[PDB]
Amino acid sequence: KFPRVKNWEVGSITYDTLSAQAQQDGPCTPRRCLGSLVFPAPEQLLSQARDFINQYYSSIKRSGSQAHEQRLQEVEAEVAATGTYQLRESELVFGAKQAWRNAPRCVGRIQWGKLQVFDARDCRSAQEMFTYICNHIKYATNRGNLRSAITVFPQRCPGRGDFRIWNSQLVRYAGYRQQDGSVRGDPANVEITELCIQHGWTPGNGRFDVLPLLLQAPDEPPELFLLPPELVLEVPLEHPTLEWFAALGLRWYALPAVSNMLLEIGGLEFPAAPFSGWYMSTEIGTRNLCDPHRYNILEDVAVCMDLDTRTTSSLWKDKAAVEINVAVLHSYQLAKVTIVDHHAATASFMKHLENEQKARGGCPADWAWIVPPISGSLTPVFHQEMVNYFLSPAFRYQPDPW
Amino acid sequence: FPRVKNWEVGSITYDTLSAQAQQDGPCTPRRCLGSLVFPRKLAPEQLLSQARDFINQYYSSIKRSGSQAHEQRLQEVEAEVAATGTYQLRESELVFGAKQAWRNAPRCVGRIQWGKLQVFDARDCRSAQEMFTYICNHIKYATNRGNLRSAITVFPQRCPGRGDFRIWNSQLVRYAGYRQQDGSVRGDPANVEITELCIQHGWTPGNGRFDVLPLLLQAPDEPPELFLLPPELVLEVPLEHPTLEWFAALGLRWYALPAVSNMLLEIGGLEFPAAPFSGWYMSTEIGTRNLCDPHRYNILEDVAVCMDLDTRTTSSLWKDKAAVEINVAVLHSYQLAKVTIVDHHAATASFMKHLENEQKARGGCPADWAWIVPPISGSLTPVFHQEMVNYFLSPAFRYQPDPW
Numbered sequence A: 001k002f003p004r005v006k007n008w009e010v011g012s013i014t015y016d017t018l019s020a021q022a023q024q025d026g027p028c029t030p031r032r033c034l035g036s037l038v039f040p041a042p043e044q045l046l047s048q049a050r051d052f053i054n055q056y057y058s059s060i061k062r063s064g065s066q067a068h069e070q071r072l073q074e075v076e077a078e079v080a081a082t083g084t085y086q087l088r089e090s091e092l093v094f095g096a097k098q099a100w101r102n103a104p105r106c107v108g109r110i111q112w113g114k115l116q117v118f119d120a121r122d123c124r125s126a127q128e129m130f131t132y133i134c135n136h137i138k139y140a141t142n143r144g145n146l147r148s149a150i151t152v153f154p155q156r157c158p159g160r161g162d163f164r165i166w167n168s169q170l171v172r173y174a175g176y177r178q179q180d181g182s183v184r185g186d187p188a189n190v191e192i193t194e195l196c197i198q199h200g201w202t203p204g205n206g207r208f209d210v211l212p213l214l215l216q217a218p219d220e221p222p223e224l225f226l227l228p229p230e231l232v233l234e235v236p237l238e239h240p241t242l243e244w245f246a247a248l249g250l251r252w253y254a255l256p257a258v259s260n261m262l263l264e265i266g267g268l269e270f271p272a273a274p275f276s277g278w279y280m281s282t283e284i285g286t287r288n289l290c291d292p293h294r295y296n297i298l299e300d301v302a303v304c305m306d307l308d309t310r311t312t313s314s315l316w317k318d319k320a321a322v323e324i325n326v327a328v329l330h331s332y333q334l335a336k337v338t339i340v341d342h343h344a345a346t347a348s349f350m351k352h353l354e355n356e357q358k359a360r361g362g363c364p365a366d367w368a369w370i371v372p373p374i375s376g377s378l379t380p381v382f383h384q385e386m387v388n389y390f391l392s393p394a395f396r397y398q399p400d401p402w
Numbered sequence B: 001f002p003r004v005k006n007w008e009v010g011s012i013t014y015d016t017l018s019a020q021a022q023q024d025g026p027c028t029p030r031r032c033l034g035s036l037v038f039p040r041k042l043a044p045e046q047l048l049s050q051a052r053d054f055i056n057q058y059y060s061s062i063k064r065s066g067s068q069a070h071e072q073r074l075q076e077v078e079a080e081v082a083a084t085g086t087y088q089l090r091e092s093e094l095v096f097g098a099k100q101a102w103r104n105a106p107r108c109v110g111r112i113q114w115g116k117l118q119v120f121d122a123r124d125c126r127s128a129q130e131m132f133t134y135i136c137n138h139i140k141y142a143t144n145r146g147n148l149r150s151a152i153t154v155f156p157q158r159c160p161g162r163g164d165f166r167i168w169n170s171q172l173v174r175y176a177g178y179r180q181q182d183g184s185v186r187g188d189p190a191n192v193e194i195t196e197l198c199i200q201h202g203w204t205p206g207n208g209r210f211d212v213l214p215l216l217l218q219a220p221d222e223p224p225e226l227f228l229l230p231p232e233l234v235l236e237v238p239l240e241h242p243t244l245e246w247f248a249a250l251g252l253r254w255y256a257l258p259a260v261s262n263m264l265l266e267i268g269g270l271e272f273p274a275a276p277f278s279g280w281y282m283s284t285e286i287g288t289r290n291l292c293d294p295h296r297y298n299i300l301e302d303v304a305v306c307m308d309l310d311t312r313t314t315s316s317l318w319k320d321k322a323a324v325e326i327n328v329a330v331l332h333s334y335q336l337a338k339v340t341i342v343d344h345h346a347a348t349a350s351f352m353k354h355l356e357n358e359q360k361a362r363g364g365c366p367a368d369w370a371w372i373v374p375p376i377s378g379s380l381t382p383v384f385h386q387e388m389v390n391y392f393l394s395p396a397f398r399y400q401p402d403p404w
């Protein structure tokens, strides 16, 4: 009674036994599917914790040992005394990797095991926070040869407030409101931009102005931190065979570093644990630039391409979109900044589902997020059925601290 | 009442229609299965409840609920089912039901047209030769010299004991798929099996990669029988690209009328195992899925070479380049040949329009996100940024076991 999953390009069939362990509940019932929605005490902490420890002890093939029982006894004894507990460092490393491994909407998961984990749980202020962050950015960027990294700030704990990073990503561009009621820069970041300003940031007026950090120490207002310019590797965008493209003045940044997600390991919550890998060209090419509610350059590129934008059947949108993606790939290659196209990405994800079926008897996957936003059926994930479910450890969304 | 958002505009709606969904789907709180093609798998007290529910909403949609013919029609069905164990549908009901089934089909992106559907009543059919005639009139009417018109043909309902009417082809028009000493395929690999059956039932096989299959039509109990389609009834379109002159030389063609002949029409509790419906192609169906899928015509790399693309690195986006041009060739050829066709952009926008219509009228619309979003340029179409609720309403089209 495990979901039969087919690959339609090949003919292969597997059953997802791993789904039957899903440690949390989703938005769907047999009445109605909601898969397409973006946003779907002590003893209960003990049962999550006990579950994680079992996981950790399985992965180090010391399952059901002395050190395993002792560790359970340790944890329940500490939840007694303090109403919480502390992860050992190896447990944290494993927990951070599993969280990525379990992230259903991530197409880059072939890499899950190669994650660099920086432990900043000793962190003290917004100031020490800023430094750890700059170091994350420095290590992960690595002069354009990107490394996967995660910095883990102190856990949610009884008595103190949370560390929070107010910014959605470590590097993001300003979005300013206007006289036309419109936005200059990235419309997705108008709110946080408003917040930065009113917290003492002297704004600019470009379309690619990098935002300051708003960092929050427990029980403090947020504190504004300017990123040292030379720490933010950017990539000016140019097209390999369309020379007017460089005159669009478009740029994107090297490091995709998501900074507003919560990391959950064994019932413990880390509201601040920014992570980063490297871009798939489509996030920038199609989503960041061509979404109407974003930079929305599609028509502008299409006109310049001298496509016929009168009628849809000329497929001007598709033609413009493909060139913008080529431009992004080319520019990142010219600059020696790591980048993966959607065909390479989805192909390593197939390898991933295959590694995962042998290893854990399945792989939690969100089809609508895994299939790229152009060339969908041109990639192998489109033809693959997938089971979506929530495993812990995990990254979760959390509400904006403001 | 699920909250549903559109991220392009920011707007919010509540799907209240979802609440009235009965026949449970595949998903549970613990695991989503929306991405699966065939959800899970494939004493007549039940027939009545399905029947009364269908009749009620029939009369709802003409205001005539409460008093009048409404009460009256409830007992006739009661009587009929009490008497016979089944019931016949009034011709208006049949029309209403066929229309609703199209309206409820969450995977269909062209439902904005659901009101303009021609129902050919063929319940008074008792022969395979007869079906063939019905199927032929459908094809003629639907095709209409390339000015396509949605039509369905409804054959007799399934009866307790004794057989079924059934079209063994998945569609009325399908190309041949021939195996060999390679295991590879000349023609369409999706139709390999039904080409096996066609041949084993007497059909004299053909040249190769665009031979229209013959039909395999099955009247109740008595075994299936082959019927050759009159070549003047099968409108086709040779594929030519507007500016890439060599494209025609590739000798690609595709047919005109997409006509699904294996799905099961279910109205008011009654099951119609044979109800061939048809409409017109959205371009990507042919351009992207049919010609470019690795397990279909798989032509993508071939077009790429001719375009002299760098097939040596995936990051050249050669696949993406080839696929657009193939799609442009499809739309161009269909237009030149004056055959109704719709591009993915136009279609999706009309589906957004359909969604807002369906919000005001029924309080929502069942939509299968993964099937509504086109197979290329997804995030470039408005449906991509629209959240969708997927659920099952009756009347419906349902998939059904094949007759083997």
Ligand code: HEM
Pocket: A096, A100, A103, A105, A106, A107, A108, A109, A111, A115, A148, A149, A150, A275, A276, A277, A278, A279, A280, A283, A340, A345, A369, A395
């Ligand atoms: C190194 C190469 C990586 C690639 C190519 C990649 C690719 C992607 C893409 C394209 C998405 C969809 C995001 C969107 O459409 O906005 C995604 C989602 C996600 N990724 Fe990865 N990623 C990488 C690294 C990582 C790392 C290092 C982590 C964590 C340690 C991670 C965790 C996640 C999570 C939690 C999501 C879902 C986020 C959400 O639902 O908003 N990824 N990934």
Ligand code: HEM
Pocket: B102, B105, B107, B108, B109, B110, B111, B113, B117, B150, B151, B152, B263, B277, B278, B279, B280, B281, B282, B285, B342, B347, B371, B397
């Ligand atoms: C007239 C214009 C129409 C357009 C442009 C259109 C387009 C589409 C598309 C793109 C799909 C996705 C399925 C696939 O690509 O394989 C689909 C599915 C479907 N359509 Fe429509 N369609 C039209 C008319 C109709 C009509 C007239 C009916 C019934 C009378 C219908 C019933 C269905 C059903 C039941 C499905 C689900 C198919 C399946 O899951 O096997 N459609 N349609």
Ligand SMILES: CCc1cc(CNC)cc(OCc2ccc3ccc(N)nc3c2)c1
Pocket: A038, A108, A256, A258, A276, A277, A278, A279, A280, A283, A287
């Ligand atoms: C609304 C939630 C959301 C939206 C969007 C973009 N919407 C236009 C992106 C979201 O996640 C964005 C994300 C997360 C993790 C990543 C890891 C690596 C990588 N290269 N990109 C990522 C990108 C979440």
Ligand SMILES: CCc1cc(CNC)cc(OCc2ccc3ccc(N)nc3c2)c1
Pocket: B037, B258, B260, B278, B279, B280, B281, B282, B285, B289
């Ligand atoms: C297997 C279920 C399935 C497969 C496939 C193709 N697989 C490569 C198509 C399916 O639906 C195919 C379909 C059904 C109804 C349509 C109505 C109108 C139209 N233009 N196209 C349709 C196309 C169902």
Ligand SMILES: C[C@H](O)[C@H](O)[C@H]1CNc2nc(N)[nH]c(=O)c2N1
Pocket: A036, A037, A038, A368, A369, A370, B007, B384, B385, B386, B387, B388
């Ligand atoms: C409404 C829809 O679910 C939403 O736009 C999703 C669809 N799939 C996606 N897939 C990825 N990878 N990223 C996204 O932002 C989205 N957006």
Ligand SMILES: C[C@H](O)[C@H](O)[C@H]1CNc2nc(N)[nH]c(=O)c2N1
Pocket: A008, A382, A383, A384, A385, A386, B034, B035, B036, B037, B370, B371, B372
């Ligand atoms: C596995 C996946 O759900 C499957 O390939 C679906 C995806 N979306 C689709 N959408 C349409 N319109 N037609 C299809 O055949 C499919 N295939």
Ligand SMILES: [Ca+2]
Pocket: B308, B309, B310
């Ligand atoms: Ca060459």
Ligand SMILES: [Cl-]
Pocket: A256, A283, A288
């Ligand atoms: Cl981004």
Ligand SMILES: [Cl-]
Pocket: B258, B285, B286, B290
């Ligand atoms: Cl088809």
Ligand SMILES: [Gd]
Pocket: A241, A242, A243
């Ligand atoms: Gd040029």
Ligand SMILES: [Gd]
Pocket: none
């Ligand atoms: Gd040449």
Ligand SMILES: [Zn+2]
Pocket: A028, A032, A033, A034, A035, B027, B028, B031, B032, B033, B034
């Ligand atoms: Zn679901």
